[PDB]
Amino acid sequence: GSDNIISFDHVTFTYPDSPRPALSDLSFAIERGSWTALIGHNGSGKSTVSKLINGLLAPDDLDKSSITVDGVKLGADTVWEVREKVGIVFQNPDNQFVGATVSDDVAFGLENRAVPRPEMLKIVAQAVADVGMADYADSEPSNLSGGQKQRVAIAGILAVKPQVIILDESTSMLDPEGKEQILDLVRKIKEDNNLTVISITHDLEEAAGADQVLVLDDGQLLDQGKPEEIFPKVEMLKRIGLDIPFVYRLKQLLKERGIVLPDEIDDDEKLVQSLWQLNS
């Protein structure tokens, strides 16, 4: 008990066609205000987590499981309440665009919430600005890069003021500068709004920066902890099939060269200073 916004409790889920559960007795919390990352391989139960947090997928035994978002228990009567609280940027940049233009696409959620139009104009302008899309305020998605359309998705998510933003493989199809753009922007949004980010990813750099990293293996929670705690455990992740971020790899290689560095070093800047201090 430490002020968690999301608490996944005893969730099992079998895709309807598939024979086996995609998630088995999975329980985890999300510390309010954190940026935690979910990572996993082949078992890819994380691909199921976002659509469960927000309600698109139900669990298997609603009597035994319970998801809770911002104090609201996810149920039949509260699905929409909860979706106001948990906003999701999704993987494919196109196919997330409803509107024929940027501004229309941001306006969609306000419309869904019956926001009086004079408010909407102000809101859509502010969001589209906050993502640096005012040059393309009236542009058609067929003329926008994937980096832009991920920004525009982010913007429409922003206009509804959610309590948690999930990036559900949101950088996975983007050019690396686009990955940094989208990551920086969601960091800026998180600071400027005191939000929580759930990142569902295979970008180990992305998860390297998370306050918390949960490891998912075959639909169960293999391990969980700060990146400085999780990513040094090279053997565990290698067996799951996961890699590790660049810094933890360079540290491990240096170890295979004989040079041993501590676990707490977890940063480009920290490491540079470490090797600096060794040469003097």
């Epitope: 609201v72 309440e81 106001e84 609280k85 306000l110 869904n112 206009a159 003021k161 709004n193």
Partner: nanobody, 126 residues
Framework: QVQLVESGGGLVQPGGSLRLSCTAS????????IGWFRQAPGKEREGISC????????TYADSVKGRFTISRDRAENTVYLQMNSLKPEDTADYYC???????????????????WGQGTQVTVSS
């Protein structure tokens, strides 16, 4: 569209009760989720309660939970806050805030609300 007006604050004895009222004028409250907040003299502003544009969802802080009850009066374009079992600590300035971007829910946080009233002052002691 901000012209929010709190009312009904004043001095009341410990264990008594009183009902604050958050009214709009020039716009309709139903277009806005309404949150009640409360800033003590040396504290930070504290979200205490709130109601959704649907009017189906309500949130209370653990401080006021079970004593205060919020309500939308559609006919009267007001949202009422009903404070019972008032204790010395409840004494503060009370504010109502409005934001349109939620229909099905509401949150008790200072951040998301865009339009505020000027606050009515509630004092409980004897």
């Amino acid at each position: 569209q901000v012209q929010l007006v709190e009312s009904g604050g004043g001095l009341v004895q410990p264990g008594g009760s009183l009902r604050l009222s958050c009214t709009a004028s020039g716009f309709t409250l139903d277009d806005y989720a309404i949150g009640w907040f409360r800033q003590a003299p040396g504290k930070e502003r504290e979200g205490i309660s709130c109601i959704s544009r649907s009017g189906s969802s309500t949130t209370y802080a653990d401080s006021v939970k079970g004593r205060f009850t919020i309500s939308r009066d559609r006919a009267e374009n007001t949202v009422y806050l009903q404070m019972n079992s008032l204790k010395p600590e409840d004494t503060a300035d009370y504010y109502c805030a409005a934001t349109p971007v939620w229909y099905w829910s509401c949150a008790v946080k200072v951040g998301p609300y865009d339009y505020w009233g000027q606050g009515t002052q509630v004092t409980v002691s004897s």
